[PDB]
Design a protein around this nucleic acid. Structure first.
Lengths: 48, 51, 113
RNA sequence: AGCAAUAGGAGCUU
């Protein structure tokens, strides 16, 4: 939940997500890129 | 000073150069009953200035 | 930020008496007096005046804390005498001595001119 | 009826 990775406020209008949130976003990007290889051409040096 | 009677012992007496250091009690005295907590841990915050 | 006012030494509140007398029951014919808003100036004067009377058996004073402007005095007397009357007697005696001292100082100062 | 985080630096008392 976001409780474990709460956002914060820097100068009254700005917010950056916690490290865990950006890490989960990077994992999601990686997952979708994986799901873009077993659907089309993938010469075995991109799947790995 | 209280009685004006002489002291039985003599007192080492004279001028000496003393210094006023930056550590004042009024810059250190802190108490907290209840106050702001941290967002993540919900535990009391850290700092005299932050209560 | 915690410093009390420098005028509470001498300004008597309206709810605080100047003087309060309680008896010491342990020994016969003894009383405990607490003087509020006074210090060593009155205490030592009264103590050394009272200590020289024949009928005064015990007299003493203390200032329990220097940060509080009061003192407490224990005074015992013999069977017939009451410590209160001896206290007024000592006060009157010091007043008379001070009056004589003042008169002699003024005459001496005039003569010095 | 609500006052960010992370770092570095200098210090206090042992």
């Amino acid at each position: 939940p976001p409780q474990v990775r709460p956002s914060i406020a820097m100068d009254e209008t700005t917010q950056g997500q916690d490290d865990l949130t950006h890490k989960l976003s990077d994992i999601l990007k990686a997952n979708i890129n994986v799901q873009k290889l077993e659907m089309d051409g993938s010469p075995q040096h991109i799947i790995n | 000073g209280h009685t004006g009677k002489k002291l039985m012992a003599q007192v080492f007496f004279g001028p000496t150069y003393y210094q006023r250091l930056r550590h004042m009690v009024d810059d250190k005295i802190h108490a907290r009953a209840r106050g702001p907590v941290q967002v993540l841990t919900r535990q009391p915050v850290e700092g005299r200035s932050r209560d | 930020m915690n410093a009390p006012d420098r005028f509470e030494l001498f300004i008597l509140p309206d709810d605080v008496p100047k003087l309060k007398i309680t008896p010491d029951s342990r020994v016969p014919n003894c009383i405990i007096i607490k003087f509020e808003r006074e210090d060593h100036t009155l205490a030592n004067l009264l103590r050394e005046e009272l200590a020289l009377y024949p009928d005064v058996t015990f007299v003493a004073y203390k200032v329990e804390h220097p940060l509080f402007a009061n003192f407490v005095m224990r005074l015992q007397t013999e069977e017939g005498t009451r410590p209160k009357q001896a206290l007024e007697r000592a006060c009157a005696s010091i007043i008379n001595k001070l009056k004589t001292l003042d008169h002699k100082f003024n005459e001496e100062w005039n003569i010095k001119n």
